[PDB]
Every structure is written in C-alpha cells, then in structure tokens.
Design a protein around this ligand. Sequence first.
Ligand code: A1EDM
Length: 117
Amino acid sequence: KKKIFKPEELRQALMPTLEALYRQDPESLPFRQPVDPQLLGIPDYFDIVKSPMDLSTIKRKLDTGQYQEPWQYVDDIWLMFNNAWLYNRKTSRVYKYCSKLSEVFEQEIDPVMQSLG
Ligand SMILES: COc1ccc(N2C(=O)CCC[C@H]2c2nc(-c3ccc4onc(C)c4c3)cn2C[C@H](C)N2CCOCC2)cc1Cl
C-alpha cells in the first residue's frame, strides 16, 4: 500500500539495521567501502558485478534522503549481498562473511519493516 515517508523517519528507523552490520567485525570489513578491484587485485570484479553496492554508499543514501520507501534500502542491502555471493567462491572468506552479514540483517530488518508498515 502507498505511504509517503519523511527521509528523517526512514533514516532513524533504518540506520540501526545498518549500524548492526557495521559492528560485525571482522565480517563487515570487506563491505565498508566500495570494492576497488585495482587495490584488491580482482580485475574481473566489474565483468561480474554491474551494480556495485557497499555500506558507505547505503549510509550516504540514507543521509541524503535518497530512499523514499524502506524496500529501496532493503533492495540495496540485498544487492550488496548478492554481489558478494556472485563474485566470490562459496569457499572464500568474503562469501562466508557475506553469509554472516545476511543472517544479522535478516534478524534486524524483519521487525523494523513491520513497524514502518
Ligand atoms: C578481515 O577480513 C579480510 C582481510 C583481508 C582481505 N583481503 C584479502 O584477503 C585479499 C585481498 C585484499 C583484502 C580484501 N578483500 C576484499 C574483498 C575481496 C573480494 C570481494 O568481493 N566482494 C567484496 C566486498 C570483496 C572484498 C576486501 N579486502 C579489504 C579488507 C576486507 N580490509 C581489511 C581491513 O581493512 C578494511 C578492509 C579480506 C578479508 Cl575478508
């Protein structure tokens, strides 16, 4: 159902789910900044991931009120996870850290979504 949200109320409801990802150490560390394929020596990264997303991009979008609806925020979190599972091998540390972050997110986001509508 349609609902108009104030960015300030989105920010205050959704920020805590984002801060819960940030406090996962070491599991959030790969996700805190945009993937720099050159710095990381993964030059195939942009062949595989066409919509990169990371926690700092998501935090900037919350702080500039670029999310109109909660589901847009969730879509960016899920894009970030999907990108990491897609690029990384099932056996790799970043894949497992991604899986850990998605479990934390799933537990944090369920009640916040209920409370927004
Ligand atoms: C604490 O965890 C790590 C420490 C180093 C590394 N790294 C490596 O093992 C070798 C490459 C440099 C570093 C590193 N890799 C990646 C990496 C790689 C592939 C990826 O696909 N999708 C994503 C997101 C992604 C990220 C990131 N990094 C930097 C590493 C996490 N830093 C460690 C602590 O300071 C800030 C970040 C990875 C992790 Cl999980």
